[PDB]
Amino acid sequence: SKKPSLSVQPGPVMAPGESLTLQCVSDVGYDRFVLYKEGERDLRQLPGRQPQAGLSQANFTLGPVSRSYGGQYRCYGAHNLSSECSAPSDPLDILITGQIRGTPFISVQPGPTVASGENVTLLCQSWRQFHTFLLTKAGAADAPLRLRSIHEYPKYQAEFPMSPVTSAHAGTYRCYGSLNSDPYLLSHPSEPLELVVS
Secondary structure (H helix, E strand, O other), X not given: OOOOEEEEEOOOEEOOOOOEEEEEEEOOOOOEEEEEEOOOOOEEEEEOEOOOOOOEEEEEEEOOOOHHHOEEEXXXXXXXXXXXXXXXXOOEEEEEOOOOOOOOEEEEEOOOEEOOOOOOEEEEEEOOXXXXXXXXXXXXXXXXXXXXXXXXXXXXXXEEEOOOOXXXXXXXXXXXXXXXXXXXXXXXXXOOEEEEEO
């Protein structure tokens, strides 16, 4: 009866028009899976398939994406005869970009070239008010990091510390802003910032 797992390809941060697949996997042979969104009435139901050995799954593909697709998703398994359903998966946040005003800026301290083992803060800043900032890393995208924005006049900002950096931290970062009206709706992205290590 154990809870299945939920994942996204290509990632959780989505621009309108894009499409994505939410995959729900369990090691219990559930006959069907049900995808649901926190606080929404509508359900999605897909039959189980066994492409991987000792594993049951379903691929929920969400068609051309919009603002209304933003939110918190969970999945659960069910059996055919049986009237019991599984424990729900851990929640998966789907974020929609370009939905609110403002464009944040990203920067590195002390810099983009970076010796392994160093302290590195990455901060997203904004002129306009944002309640939260999001740090994403170019796909594979499985984050993303969220932080409450701190108002330090005349800017809003958030520090994403990566003290002890490793070669793994290296990559291309973007930075997003969000408001409490809907934390699943993001601003347009900042310019990318490529982090390199050596």
